[PDB]
Amino acid sequence: SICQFKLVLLGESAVGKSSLVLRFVKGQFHEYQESTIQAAFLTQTVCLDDTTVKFEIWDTAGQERYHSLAPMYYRGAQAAIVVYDITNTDTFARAKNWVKELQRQASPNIVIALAGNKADLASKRAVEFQEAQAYADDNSLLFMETSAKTAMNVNEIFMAIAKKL
Numbered sequence: 001s002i003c004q005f006k007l008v009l010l011g012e013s014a015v016g017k018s019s020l021v022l023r024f025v026k027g028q029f030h031e032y033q034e035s036t037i038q039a040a041f042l043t044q045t046v047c048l049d050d051t052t053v054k055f056e057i058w059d060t061a062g063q064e065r066y067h068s069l070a071p072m073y074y075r076g077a078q079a080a081i082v083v084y085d086i087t088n089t090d091t092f093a094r095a096k097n098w099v100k101e102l103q104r105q106a107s108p109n110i111v112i113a114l115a116g117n118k119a120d121l122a123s124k125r126a127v128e129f130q131e132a133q134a135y136a137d138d139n140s141l142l143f144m145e146t147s148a149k150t151a152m153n154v155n156e157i158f159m160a161i162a163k164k165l
């Protein structure tokens, strides 16, 4: 059996979208990753209990000037990962508005995950785990804290999404 899933990453600029995709797909992390100006397309293939799973992944430009283009990438998506930065409350608020947009405008069957990224920066935390967990539970979102830098929960969040599709 082979399954293929269409996935999109959304979120404020600098939260770590490209770093997360790069860690999952290439096992790489770049401390000096440049801001995305044009959406990038990547694939990874994994094994999941009796199935070979291929991911098709859109890594969007997070800056607000590219907002109007986002539906090109999420309208056909089966799953989305909305990413925020645990060290910045404003990015968590922005993530909630991405979630709201998906709920109103993307497929009614979309699986929405929420990633609290940069969790390795524990001494710089702004958003408490419990607050994000409660928001996720209330809105039916698949929530994990992640680190592209250390790889913490990077494999885990993509695999959890695949299990639910």
Ligand SMILES: Nc1nc2c(ncn2[C@@H]2O[C@H](COP(=O)(O)OP(=O)(O)NP(=O)(O)O)[C@@H](O)[C@H]2O)c(=O)[nH]1
Binding pocket: 011, 012, 013, 014, 015, 016, 017, 018, 019, 020, 030, 031, 032, 033, 034, 035, 036, 037, 060, 061, 062, 063, 117, 118, 119, 120, 121, 146, 147, 148, 149, 150
């Ligand atoms: N400490 C730490 N730094 C991280 C982590 N993930 C990304 N970064 C760093 O944060 C910066 C921004 O990451 P990047 O992936 O470019 O963010 P982005 O969400 O793709 N930005 P844009 O939307 O503008 O393309 C980079 O310097 C990157 O190395 C993480 O988990 N921990």
Ligand SMILES: [Mg+2]
Binding pocket: 017, 018, 019, 034, 035, 036, 059, 060, 061, 062
């Ligand atoms: Mg990027």
